[PDB]
Each structure stands twice: as structure tokens, then as C-alpha cells.
Design a protein around this ligand. Sequence first.
Ligand SMILES: [Ca+2]
Ligand SMILES: [Ca+2]
Ligand SMILES: [Ca+2]
Ligand SMILES: [Ca+2]
Lengths: 81, 81
Amino acid sequence: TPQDIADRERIFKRFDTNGDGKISSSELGDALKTLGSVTPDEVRRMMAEIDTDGDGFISFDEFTDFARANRGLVKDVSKIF
Amino acid sequence: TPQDIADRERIFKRFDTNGDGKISSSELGDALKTLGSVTPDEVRRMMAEIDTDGDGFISFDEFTDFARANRGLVKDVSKIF
Ligand SMILES: [Ca+2]
Ligand SMILES: [Ca+2]
Ligand SMILES: [Ca+2]
Ligand SMILES: [Ca+2]
């Protein structure tokens, strides 16, 4: 969980572009937006994190395993986006 | 419950643009790329989910509450950011 802190502290600091310790609406929107330009290497890295078996596809079971671990995925992503 | 699956399946099927029942690396990238056009309303609704106290900002505490519950998203996102 020191890794849990590090990654969390890391993402927060990157979203909080003005460094005032909090994320504004504009900051959140700016962060989300930088994915319209998600790099090829970055996509490959995320793919490897969810495609557990490394067969080159995310199966429904692999997606479910991810979703069960991140319940604030589907509720938020499914509904909003 | 039937709605919980119905929801998960709805996101999975939205990502699976060629309909082969699996999500490929290019499909994952396309899904991530839709965040480049996130709308003001969508941002507001994600703020509503994470900004619990309604002050219009996401505190590090508020972010932490979200991240504890979505550890995998956060690990993974943390490499793009
Ligand atoms: Ca800020
Ligand atoms: Ca797989
Ligand atoms: Ca597919
Ligand atoms: Ca707040």
C-alpha cells in the first residue's frame, strides 16, 4: 500500500496543475481531456494491466474482474460517459 | 443482480465496436480517446461523485476516498499521468 499512496499522490499532483492542493472542475476536465491524445505506448501499458492472460484481448471475464475491483468504475463510467 | 451485470455488459458492448465479443488494444485506445471530448456536464457529474462536501473542489481526502475504492483504476491511470 505504500505503492497505493505513491500512485495516488502521483496522479493527484498531475491533475492538480496549479499545485494549490485541490482539484477544480477545470483541472478535472483538463486531466480527462489529455486522453484524446493517449499515446500508443500508454495504451499498450493499460492493455497489459487488464488483459490478464496476455492473449491480446480483454475478455468479458477480464473486464468483470477489473470492474469487481473498481465498483466506482461502472457506476461512474457506465452512467456518465 | 440483473441490473449490475446489465450495466457492465452495456459498457463492454460499447467498447467492443467490431462485435467479436472481445476488446482489442485499438478498441481500448478508442474508448480512452472519447475522454478528449468529455462534456462540461460530464465533468460536473464526475465532480458530483468525488467532491462529497460540495465545495466545488476535490480535496486530497476526497480523492483518496475514491482511490481506495478503485485501486486498480488508480494503479493503471498512474502510468499515463
Ligand atoms: Ca488545483
Ligand atoms: Ca485476455
Ligand atoms: Ca472487439
Ligand atoms: Ca470538496
